[PDB]
Amino acid sequence: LQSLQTYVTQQLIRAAEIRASANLAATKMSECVLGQSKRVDFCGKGYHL
Amino acid sequence: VAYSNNSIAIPTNFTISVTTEILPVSMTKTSVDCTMYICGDSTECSNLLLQYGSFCTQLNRALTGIAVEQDKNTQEVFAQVKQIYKTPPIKDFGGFNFSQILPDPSKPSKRSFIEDLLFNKVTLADAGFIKQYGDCLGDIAARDLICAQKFNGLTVLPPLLTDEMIAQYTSALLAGTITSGWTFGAGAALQIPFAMQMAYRFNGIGVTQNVLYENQKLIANQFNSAIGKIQDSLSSTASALGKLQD
Amino acid sequence: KKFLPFQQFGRDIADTTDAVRDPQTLEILDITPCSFGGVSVITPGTNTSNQVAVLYQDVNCTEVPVAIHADQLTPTWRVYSTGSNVFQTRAGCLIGAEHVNNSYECDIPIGAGICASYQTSQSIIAYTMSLGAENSVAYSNNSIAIPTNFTISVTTEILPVSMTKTSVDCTMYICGDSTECSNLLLQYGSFCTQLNRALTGIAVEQDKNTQEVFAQVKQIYKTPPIKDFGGFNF
Amino acid sequence: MAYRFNGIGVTQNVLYENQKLIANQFNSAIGKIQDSLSSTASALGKLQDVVNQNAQALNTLVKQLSSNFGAISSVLNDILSRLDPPEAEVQIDRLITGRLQSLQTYVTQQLIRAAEIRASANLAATKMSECVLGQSKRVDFCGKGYHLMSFPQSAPHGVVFLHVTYVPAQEKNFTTAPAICHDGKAHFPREGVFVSNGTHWFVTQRNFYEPQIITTDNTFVSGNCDVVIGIVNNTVYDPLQPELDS
Amino acid sequence: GTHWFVTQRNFYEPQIITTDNTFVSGNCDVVIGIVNNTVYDPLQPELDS
């Protein structure tokens, strides 16, 4: 039970990190793919097209 | 920097550059049978575990919530547009060549060449439980292979979205970006020549469109060279996909 | 497996026996457990209906009565282990679901593109999901499309801000009003201090979350008495 | 509203010529939102997870006291009234370890849930500081479509945003050219798109149809007209030429 | 070093300084580092009657 609890807690932390990464990826999709972003160094490096 | 109160530097040319960014989306959806993992159908062990309470139900609920959250992340990162746009049969986008990124109709899988390289790069060669669980699906020639609970109840759930529909969504996004620009994201798709889209995206960064209309051939050649360089770098032995491998 | 001579049994990484040798004929065997507990059920709401369909996870439809030993169970378990509406997919075996060739929006997700919904003679149907409406763009190198009208639309977005501020007394929850038990609790250290401090930090963070969201401005602006907004009605 | 229309590339004369239509469309959209919210829709489920998960975790915390964790009884007073401290302490510490481990598990899950709320609250504060306090050029951040304004509303354990967006409709096909060659010189549009109905050439803005006569005020000249791919020969009207009679 | 020109900030596109691409605001003495130069007027190269 201690081993399973450790595994579940580590999986929860990793899932939170994956959630943050997926939210960042969805934001990058919605900005750079569906339009042009004026934010510097958000979509690649330099002036984004 | 040669700084002064009356000196400025103005570029005389430019270089179109294509870079690669890799971001993780989802993880492996794993479900654990707590009672099976604790013991192998021992009724005395089950009776002793029932004295502890609702630990196994809580862990199963947490794992189910994790899997549902992974599916929600994939759906919210890929199903941005509900209109599945198709690529035009004739491709004359001002000399720009998108053959490396467009889907290939010559294969049952709708993945592109670059997508095929990405799929071939990431592998489960030296993995442990995941590769052993996936090998049971390649061992279907032998009957009576109950590999679902063979590893003490540790199961791997298949994703809600498979690779084919994800590739279809990416192809639809590429078609909407090429044919409609940024208009299809806000609302209904508006067809537009690719030169107009390049001109207005040049205008969005403070560059007049006559630069594009005078150097379109050079811009297309530089873009094709950058696409070829990206393809050659991805096809090389460099481990550029280490983020998903982690 | 080439069993060199007196090496008799085997085990995996988790020390469970996977190979064994018969002590009489000296033949070699392989071992695969057979319990199964991973069942899934797709059902609508009880306030709506009472029909129920069950998914058998990662097992073939031809091996259901052997893995679960259905013939030794109730006939209601038998009729849900063998029936007319039996379907096999990548996710596993579905019994009771009505497979159709149509495609709709996903209602109850199963896996590998399989979704179920309640359809009218009401029954639970199973179908492959539809990504969306099929669309094509009439692309050309000299043709453009310009909109002639527009529609103002209002969309609703909901985001959580705060969370219920809970506070737990560690000494009370472990054992109430017992001095002997409280004496034994001090032998475990400052575990109660850590839990009280962690929950206090959560409650402060919840108040910070409400403060940092709703107090972007520091002046309370009163609404004007007249509503002359050019036809806009707020 | 005229300035916010100017923020998405629409000229302010379009809003003033259709102010009554915009106000009627906005009031109908508010009533449609009000009628949809007043119905039996379950769109408030995002706030419902916070309430239900807290209620489930609190009930699981209470129900964990019923477990004996291998002791004689789950009641502390039963052990204290039946046993003596020379032999009661071997039964108490099993209940101590079981209940403390449940308290460790609950607080750990609360900390993970608090971090999830922290990410959502930071996103809500970012949306409030951008959509409400100004106009955002970012795509699909303040709702789907071209964002104009937003209205925040209070909610139990959350906030509700009412994004007012701009969605074009009633598309029409047109024939376009990148530039116009008039006297051997290429004329490019200053802001809009060169369009034609097949008989006459007009210039209109990108996000709305409003044809205008091609003049020197709305066009600029850059280089010869031999290097532009797809150029169309057409005349350019001079607003100064009829006034030269003196 | 010989003649003055006006160009955009991201590309070298020298042009003749006219009244269309410029505007007038204030006198010469307030601006620090002003340079005396002529400005072409496209209204009257020869446009007289």
Ligand SMILES: *[C@@H]1O[C@H](CO)[C@@H](O)[C@H](O)[C@H]1NC(C)=O
């Ligand atoms: C399930 O049964 C089908 C047909 O009998 C067979 O082709 C397939 O390999 C079986 N799957 C497994 C995992 O045994």
Ligand SMILES: *[C@@H]1O[C@H](CO)[C@@H](O)[C@H](O)[C@H]1NC(C)=O
């Ligand atoms: C045990 O006896 C059986 C029956 O005669 C025989 O077939 C088998 O070979 C014997 N095994 C050994 C190890 O002698």
Ligand SMILES: *[C@@H]1O[C@H](CO)[C@@H](O)[C@H](O)[C@H]1NC(C)=O
């Ligand atoms: C429950 O069912 C009743 C009718 O039996 C219906 O009026 C009601 O709206 C239903 N509730 C929900 C939440 O669907």
Ligand SMILES: *[C@@H]1O[C@H](CO)[C@@H](O)[C@H](O)[C@H]1NC(C)=O
């Ligand atoms: C569904 O498609 C299969 C072939 O994929 C066909 O055999 C079957 O008759 C179809 N059923 C219906 C109801 O169209």
Ligand SMILES: *[C@@H]1O[C@H](CO)[C@@H](O)[C@H](O)[C@H]1NC(C)=O
């Ligand atoms: C557009 O493509 C067609 C081929 O379908 C070609 O004949 C025509 O010249 C092209 N026009 C321009 C302006 O590139």
Ligand SMILES: *[C@@H]1O[C@H](CO)[C@@H](O)[C@H](O)[C@H]1NC(C)=O
């Ligand atoms: C610019 O710097 C030079 C070098 O120090 C100096 O001589 C000149 O006066 C400066 N210009 C102004 C306007 O101060």
